[PDB]
Design a protein around this ligand. Structure first.
Ligand code: CA
Ligand code: CA
Ligand code: CA
Ligand code: CA
Lengths: 213, 213
């Protein structure tokens, strides 16, 4: 049977609301006044009244901005009832697919990570791994894709930047010589993660590296 | 049965084209690859290729601006064929209703109308009727509704304006005393018609009034 195709609605819409999405119609409206209604989560059960249908035009409406990170898909049913009170169609499946926008900034899993490394490991040696998440989508867009970086080091001894970070994995490595527990037992690195793989909004944290004897 | 509701498309659209209108879908696409096509005037017969359907997505498309005054409605059919070459649905009726914009200026039925009136008819006496048409719609909007007016009179004897016009009917009447064949045997009135019932674009003509002895 011919059905309504899933309907794609970008999240965080600006309206105006209510917003027309699709017009339901039974062709038995040749003969009878028909009353359209809708059921399902989003309509008559939680969250109620996100969608509605105009009972005489059949126009399915969306009444407010959506948010993919709360609900990504809605499964509704459309119904058609004669003026006399008989349902004149099997309920129609309607699907609403909510599409991603970049409405979330990245968030580090901790404000402060802690790792350690031996003085005198060769340059290129992995030290620790840091991690940030993004609620948005990483499969079809870069809204959820994170770019790791290092904003600065303290102290700047012996060199101004002694560590680097893998922009995808967040592994921090040593890139310099001169680590020396006795001279400088600890470094504090301000670390940053940016969504859109670098083009987006940024968040910040720190990583503390103990220099092992 | 649940069908596609007639689809309203304002004429003279600015695109971009091709433009998505509606997404056809057979639910037998669970089991089989389905190929969508469309027939009817506007699709596979004249004017051909105004509409099209993407054979695998089912997306009905409009490929160029429409014009209500050439074609106000299109009746198409949608079809669904399995990869194996069987049609798996009765063809679906699709209707496209083209909605009016004010794309036509008014046009007088003649460049020059001719009428006559006796000197010394009382003020208020009907003289002649002029007529303009507008292709646009007069039922739901004022795009086709015309406002008649008089831009000027020649000669300006004895008074500057001796005639008036019914802003709806275009009947010209005498509003002054002093008509006199011997003094002034003829007047030439520049007449105007404006759509949007006065707020629109204007066209111009003349009416020649013979003054009868
Ligand atoms: Ca994001
Ligand atoms: Ca998002
Ligand atoms: Ca017009
Ligand atoms: Ca028009």
């Amino acid at each position: 049977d011919w059905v309504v195709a899933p309907i794609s609605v970008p999240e965080n819409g600006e309206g105006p609301f209510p917003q027309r999405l699709n017009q339901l119609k039974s062709n038995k409206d040749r003969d009878t006044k028909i009353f359209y209604s809708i059921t399902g989560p989003g309509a008559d059960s939680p969250p109620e009244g996100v969608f509605a249908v105009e009972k005489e035009t059949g126009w399915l409406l969306l009444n407010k901005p959506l948010d993919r990170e709360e609900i990504a898909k809605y499964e509704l049913f459309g119904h058609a009832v004669s003026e006399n009170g008989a349902s004149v169609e099997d309920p129609m499946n309607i699907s609403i697919i909510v599409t991603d926008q970049n409405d979330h900034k990245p968030k580090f899993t901790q404000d402060t990570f802690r790792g350690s490394v031996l003085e005198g490991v060769l340059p290129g040696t992995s030290v620790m791994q840091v991690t940030a998440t993004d609620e948005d989508d990483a499969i079809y867009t870069y809204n959820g894709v994170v770019a790791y970086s290092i904003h600065s080091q303290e102290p700047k001894d012996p060199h101004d930047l002694m560590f680097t970070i893998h922009r995808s994995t967040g592994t921090i490595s040593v890139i310099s010589s001169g680590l020396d527990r006795e001279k400088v037992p600890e470094y504090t690195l301000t670390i940053q993660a940016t969504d859109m793989d670098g083009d987006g909004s940024t968040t910040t944290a720190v990583a503390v590296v103990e220099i092992l004897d």
